[PDB]
């Protein structure tokens with residue numbers, strides 16, 4: 220059975236289980252069951268499923284080299300699909316809440332969930348909470364008897380926590396750390412001293428690499444009972460490296476990819492985000508350029524946004540991106556070589572993840 | 581050691597553990613650690629700690645009749661305090677998110693967290709997420725080796741889910757179920773046909789009885805390794821009964837308790853909530869009264885709110901409350917008697933919970 224069709228078929232199974240359980244144990248009525256079905260579809264479907272499918276692909280790699288009864292193969296793949304949907308539902312939770320937090324308009328070509336006329340922020344915040352709860356409901360149901368349940372739940376909850384911490388790093392990245400204070404409205408930085416590579420790297424590591432790369436890779440190992448097969452320190456290092464490259468790409472696209480192709484209007488400049496573009500620009504600008512950047516960054520005024528985009532273009536950040544990319548290639552190939560020492564099979568799965576990430580349009 | 585002082589001392593311990601771990605494993609800086617410390621204090625402290633202290637009191641009851649080394653007594657009480665703080669932090673998550681969802685102004689005499697000048701909704705939604713994540717972080721740390729860990733985490737996550745489902749029941753209680761539709765802005769009911777005792781009971785059961793009464797009672801049993809000591813069906817029944825009475829009291833106070841004593845301005849009438857007052861009024865009103873209620877309910881206009889409060893007063897709902905209270909007393913005393921069959925000790929703990937709830941100002 221092709222991997223994607225299996226993964227989509229398990230979605231339908233998981234949805235039916237969750238909604239039937241709401242009817243049989245939570246006293247839900249059919250109209251609210253329908254609302255939640257539509258909410259689940261709208262928030263969980265329509266992406267590329269890169270995260271969930273990585274769990275499946277890692278498990279497939281091990282199936283190819285490990286002796287198993289057919290029924291065991293099917294159980295492992297089913298577990299990989301359920302675990303993959305746990306990650307997709309976790310992402311769906313974060314996108315629902317983040318779109319509300321940020322006042323975002325569009326997501327994947329459609330209005331953000333909270334903007335649907337019959338949803339509203341009042342319902343959408345709670346819908347996002349339900350999405351997160353569903354990750355646990357499906358784990359307890361499908362993995363109740365599994366040897367990996369404890370490790371999987373502990374990993375999942377540490378990754379979720381890291382992600383929430385990273386969101387804090389992200390939403391506060393345009394303020395001076397020494398002025399953070401719940402009692403005092405937060406001004407934007409004027410010196411941009413905290414727009415550094417190390418600080419940027421911390422934001423990205425926590426806000427997206429744990430849930431986008433580390434969690435799918437390790438979940439694939441856990442459902443395969445293969446985690447002792449690998450050097451976990453190398454898995455972490457390669458996850459954080461590839462995840463950072465993925466975010467740098469997203470940052471560049473926020474500014475330069477047409478909104479029709481991107482699926483939203485990028486607002487990182489207006490929002491004064493600590494983006495790879497801003498950090499790298501400040502890493503090579505002269506004094507006059509820095510001053511012009513400070514005069515225009517972080518303002519909704521489209522004229523000022525236009526000055527910033529021109530500063531970026533004139534600064535030839537394309538060349539910095541190429542140099543960054545070439546270094547990531549060196550380092551990821553090195554880590555893949557190191558992963559071959561204990562598991563050539565897993566190293567190949569990581570090579571596939573890198574190729575997909577690197578070649579992403 | 582007095583129970584409350586022990587419970588508060590464990591708060592300081594848990595806070596220090598969480599913040600130290602953020603520094604040592606999550607790369608946090610001191611100013612963000614300070615923000616999160618203030619967030620934790622502001623959102624978790626200042627209530628009566630009824631929920632968390634119930635865990636401690638249930639555990640104390642069993643300690644009085646069970647043979648244990650002193651060090652075991654101390655471990656059980658410490659676990660009960662950590663588990664109690666898990667519930668308090670879960671509540672703190674729900675109050676942060678609910679105040680945002682509802683546009684609330686005050687909570688416990690202070691501004692709602694999201695209203696603090698240096699917080700804002702953008703940060704506060706995520707702060708609420710961190711609060712929930714902390715419930716799991718503390719469980720894995722303090723209960724890692726405990727026999728009850730699996731049961732406790734499974735219970736906790738089912739109660740959290742029930743609570744989120746109940747919030748959906750609550751926020752949709754003024755709409756006609758057959759018209760729920762993410763695509764269509766939701767009108768308020770005009771017939772109020774779904775303002776019934778059974779529908780009200782479903783809202784309250786899920787939105788507050790699971791986390792306010794069932795979870796503390798059963799967590800107290802789990803940290804005492806005493807759950808086989810009791811009839812779990814009776815624990816559920818008495819939790820749902822006492823929890824409903826607790827919410828009816830809250831509903832009456834929303835309308836009639838002065839805001840200085842209540843700690844907020846009640847807006848259930850303006851928000852068109854399915855409250856005990858509205859259901860009970862509609863259960864005894866004549867046609868003219870029903871028509872006047874429909875003409876004024878669910879509007880911010882203070883003149884209309886005033887008509888509703890007068891309708892309630894003229895309807896002598898005080899007498900319905902007294903009859904409701906007398907029936908709850910009968911039923912709770914009956915369930916306590918039944919609990920004595922297998923555990924007089926636990927029955928007494930429940931009697932104490934009821935007395936505290938019943939005598940609440």
Ligand SMILES: COc1ccc([N+](=O)[O-])cc1O
Pocket residue numbers: 269270273431432435465571572573574575576577579
């Ligand atoms: C977590 O795995 C992945 C994450 C992202 C991509 N990508 O192509 O962007 C591919 C992956 O297999």
Ligand SMILES: COc1ccc([N+](=O)[O-])cc1O
Pocket residue numbers: 630631634792793796826932933934935936937938940
């Ligand atoms: C969950 O236990 C309790 C809940 C509420 C109260 N009360 O007095 O409101 C007392 C309790 O011991």
Ligand SMILES: [Zn+2]
Pocket residue numbers: 317320321389
């Ligand atoms: Zn965001």
Ligand SMILES: [Zn+2]
Pocket residue numbers: 469470473
């Ligand atoms: Zn972006």
Ligand SMILES: [Zn+2]
Pocket residue numbers: 678681682750
């Ligand atoms: Zn509410």
Ligand SMILES: [Zn+2]
Pocket residue numbers: 830831834
């Ligand atoms: Zn209330």
